[PDB]
Backbone:
């Protein structure tokens, strides 16, 4: 049985053009689902949509929305109305370097909108649909910064922790229903974002000993969907988190991040 | 002698706002030079200028210029006219992920302008000034991609190799003159931009460390690779492997 048969006709990827987003689109398309792909870069989404259609033979719908902006979620809801929905993933994230006081309120609000408000509007709306039909799946993406905290980029971890804890709660609520919910928590992931800050050196190599590909993250999330509630992607990351939790104080972990 | 006494009154940092550019600004201000700080993000430049004046008590001149655009160099030259110039560093770079055919021509021409044309215009203009007065210094910044190549970001490596080999040539030309020229080649450097892309660890040199090494070797060494590990890694790629293996490794 494939994802279309198990969960429903269309899957919604919220933040579809970067690495992990793109890999979600490809995975659900390979699983037979038609793909609603959402993000701010419409041209890039259109290219990806054509690639998905040509590679997988599924239908696509491209929705331009900026998740930092008011009305983004409503744009999405209008785009999916009348579709048989089987899947949602919230992938988008916004962070911004700076101490709390050095980041202007407008940017803080943008981050709240991406990581908290648009996130929850979408999660709530599609959970209503999935719960009413007693059928569907959600995999939301968090970050190890949601566990460690993120000094000098405080809202990264704060927002990702909101996503983590909200999704953990809902994952538990859905046990023994027809809706399967999971949060997958990512560490350092191989993106063009990353590679373009790795211009050379053995230190460039040292990052790949602990970087996962977007595909391996998505593969692990789907392997555990409906079995585990809260997953840390990759073995090394699981063990690293466990060693921080078990053998160090909270302060040591925070301070390590801030060092 | 501090930098002021050795080379001259004003230093010009082309690409002053990001990590390495900022480190150059602080270093030359610490060495007693007034700082011409150039880049596209004028608000950010003004903040840095304020910090430099506040900390070091040197003069600053902020020049808004976009090095991808024609006439950027000529904007900078107008700003430095009448200043006693001692130092220049070309720090700015522009890269763009994609196979050569997938990058639009306009973007290719922008990269050419940032990495080659504006670079060389500035290098030529300020070398004329330094050579005529027989004093001055230039430290240009290259990248290990200029050595390895950069598959899926071809113009980055190509442009950085242009900067590398041009600066190497000029560094040699200046030996035994009052002008000291150096190229410092950087690998992965510890910046906020890198750290934001390492959410799960590890949590390399800092820009400050790279700039410190460059100034330590200025007038002694022509072409420096920043950091001991990077020097050893490039040696081993050069000595123990074919050129193709190194290229394929970067592409993998």
Residues:
């Amino acid at each position: 049985m494939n994802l279309r048969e198990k969960y429903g006709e269309w899957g919604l990827i919220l933040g579809a053009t970067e690495g992990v987003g793109k890999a979600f689109c490809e995975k659900i398309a390979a699983g037979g689902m038609n793909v609603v792909m959402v993000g701010r870069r419409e041209e890039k989404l259109n290219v990806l949509a054509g690639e998905i259609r040509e590679t997988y033979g599924v239908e696509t719908k491209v929705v331009r929305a900026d998740f930092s902006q008011p009305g983004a979620a409503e744009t999405v809801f209008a785009a999916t109305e009348g579709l048989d929905m089987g899947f949602m993933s919230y992938v988008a994230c916004l962070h911004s370097f700076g101490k709390i006081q050095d980041t202007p309120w407008e940017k803080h609000e943008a981050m709240i909108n991406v990581n908290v408000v648009t996130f929850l509007k979408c999660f709530h709306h599609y959970m209503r649909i999935f719960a009413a039909q007693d059928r569907g799946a959600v995999i939301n993406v968090s970050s190890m910064t949601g566990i460690s905290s993120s000094p000098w980029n405080g809202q990264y971890g704060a927002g990702k922790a909101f996503i983590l804890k909200m999704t953990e709660a809902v994952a538990c609520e859905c046990e023994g229903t027809g809706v399967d919910v999971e949060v997958i928590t990512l560490g350092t992931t191989l993106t063009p974002s990353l590679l373009s800050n790795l211009p050379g050196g053995p230190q460039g190599e040292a990052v790949m000993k602990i970087a996962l590909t977007p595909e391996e993250c998505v593969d692990e999330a789907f392997e555990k969907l409906g079995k585990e509630l809260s997953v840390i992607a990759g073995q090394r990351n699981k063990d690293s988190v466990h060693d921080w939790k078990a053998n160090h104080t909270e302060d040591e972990y925070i301070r390590y991040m801030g060092s």
Summary: The interface with chain B takes residues 95, 97, 143-145, 150, 152-153, 156, 186-189, 191-204, 206-207, 210, 237, 240, 256-257, 259 of chain A (CB under 8 Å). The first helix of chain A runs from residue 3 to 6. Strands of chain A lie at 10-14, 34-39, 60-64, 85-90, 136-143, 179-186, 230-232.
